[PDB]
Structures are given as C-alpha cells and as structure tokens.
Design a protein around this ligand. Structure first.
Ligand code: ANP
Ligand code: MG
Length: 268
C-alpha cells in the first residue's frame, strides 16, 4: 500500500541531504486536512536501505517517534514523514542557549518515553544521538532516523552485527565495540551520551578524540564530566546509562521512571 503522488505537493527548498538524496518539505492531502510533511527523496543498496527504514517505521506508533505517512513512487521513490518544524535537538540547543534545565529535562524525558516504547516493541534504534531527536515545538521532541534500526528476533534480546561499518563509536556501548552486540541496553548507553549532548547545548561528545581513544578512555573507567549547569541528578543518570557491564546497566523502563519522577519533583 502506497501514497498517491497526485495528493503530494513538494516545496523546492530542501531541509537536508544524505547519501540517498535530499529531504524536502511538502504537503499531503489527507481525508480533509492538508498535512505538512518531510520527504526523503532517493536520488541499489541506497533503495534497499530506505525500504528497510520504511519497514521499521510502518510498525511503530508512539507520540515520541516521528511517524511515517507512507511511501510514494512516481518521478522518484519517496519516504513521507510527519514534519518536525524546529529540526534537530543539537542544532536547536546550540542556537537557543536560553533554554532552561527544566525544559531540557522535559525533552530528554520525552525521548526516554519513546525509547521505553521502542524497547517494549523489541526494536533497537542503533543511532540514538541528539542529531536524531527532532523538535515539533520547544516542548515536544520525537526520535527520528531508523536507518540502522533492527527488529529483534522473538528468541533474542540483541542484534549481532557481522562486521564494523560506518559506526557512530562515540555513542556506542563497550559490548557494541567489543562483541558487535546491539540491544535496548546499548541504546540506553547512547541515551546517556544524548543526555550529555542536550545538557551541553548540542556540543559534540569526547571533543577532539579518535574512536580508539574513546574506547581506551572508557576501559580505564573514565567518563565525560558534568556539563556546566547540569543538575547533579541528571549527571548521575548519565553515569548509570554508562554502566560498563550490560547486565547491570538499567533498561529504558528504569531510565524513564527515574526521569519522570525527577521531572515531576522539579514541577513540584
Ligand atoms: N521528519 C522530519 N521532519 C523534519 N525534518 C526532517 C525530518 N527528517 C529529516 N529531516 C531533516 O533532514 C536532515 C537530514 O535527514 P537525516 O534523517 O539526518 O538523513 P542523513 O542520511 O543522516 N543526512 P545527514 O544528517 O546530513 O548525515 C535532518 O537533520 C533534518 O534537518
Ligand atoms: Mg542525519
């Protein structure tokens, strides 16, 4: 089942670009309302990758995950998604230093809610970073980019990668680097890095370090420090996400609960 090209209107300007091609803003005529959308436009593996991305998104339904409207094929093969007007979380915080810690807590908590749902759904994101969190409003975040995502088999709690590819190593847990094992707990490690990025206002983690130097740092039990003005309770949570041993590392249910309670304590 596909979208009708005649019901899609594209704006010529591009929101982004990838190896696949470009991302463009558009409008899709729904039953009555016209919906603003973001469209990934493919320019053979590139097509297989986008189709696998669509296959994952088709199965997800959560307020904190970017929804796929559908696939459209006419002059080009297209992946139609809902539009997150404010763009990537890292770029937004870089340009909006006035954002309060309470607001950052709210957004990272929303990411933890989407990840809690992903974990329950038995999918591993594998690219959970601040650049992949898209903002609908300054108070509404959604997880995007299911390009490296995997639906875990009914009998396993991890996805085993064959060989090391183009990996975002700085966001990867030690078992990913060492055993090529990807689980919801490895996404928890990435979520810790994402939290650090968010409280650092979109600064890059492990500044000026090579991937191998990051692995060597973590193996010595060393971790990134507390970002300037970051609540200590949030830094403690990042360190819990960065638990070396996968078995002792918390899952998204524990992480979301810790975040939820801390946010409501701040509200109180
Ligand atoms: N659903 C969406 N809503 C709003 N903007 C989007 C959406 N999807 C993608 N974009 C924009 O397009 C950019 C690139 O898309 P992305 O999913 O990151 O693909 P990519 O292959 O990783 N390209 P790049 O980030 O440059 O390495 C994002 O950083 C957003 O600015
Ligand atoms: Mg990208």
């Amino acid at each position: 089942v596909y979208l009708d090209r005649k019901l899609l209107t594209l704006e010529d300007k591009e929101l982004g670009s990838g190896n696949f091609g470009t991302v463009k803003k558009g409008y899709y005529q729904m039953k009555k309302v016209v919906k603003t959308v973001a469209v990934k436009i493919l320019k053979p593996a590139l097509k297989d990758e986008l189709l696998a991305e669509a296959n994952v998104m088709q199965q997800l339904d959560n307020p904190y995950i970017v929804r796929m409207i559908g696939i459209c094929e006419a002059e080009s093969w297209m992946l139609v998604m809902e539009m997150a007007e404010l763009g990537p979380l890292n770029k937004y915080l870089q340009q909006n230093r006035h954002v309060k810690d309470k607001n950052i807590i709210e957004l990272v908590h929303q990411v933890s809610m989407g990840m809690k749902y992903l974990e329950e759904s038995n999918f591993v994101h594998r690219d959970l970073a601040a650049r992949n969190v898209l903002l609908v409003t300054q108070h509404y975040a959604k997880i995007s980019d299911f390009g490296l995502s995997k639906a875990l088999r009914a009998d396993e709690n991890y996805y085993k990668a064959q060989t090391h590819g183009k990996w975002p190593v700085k966001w990867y847990a030690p078992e990913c680097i060492n055993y090529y094992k990807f689980s919801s707990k490895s996404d928890v490690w990435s979520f810790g890095v994402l939290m650090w990025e968010a409280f650092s206002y979109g600064q890059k983690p492990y500044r000026g370090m090579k991937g191998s130097e990051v692995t060597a740092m973590l193996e010595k039990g060393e971790r990134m420090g507390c970002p300037a003005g970051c609540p200590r309770e949030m830094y403690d949570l990042m360190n819990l996400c960065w638990t070396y041993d996968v078995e002792n590392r918390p899952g998204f249910a524990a992480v979301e609960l810790r975040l939820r309670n801390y946010y409501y304590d701040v509200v109180n």
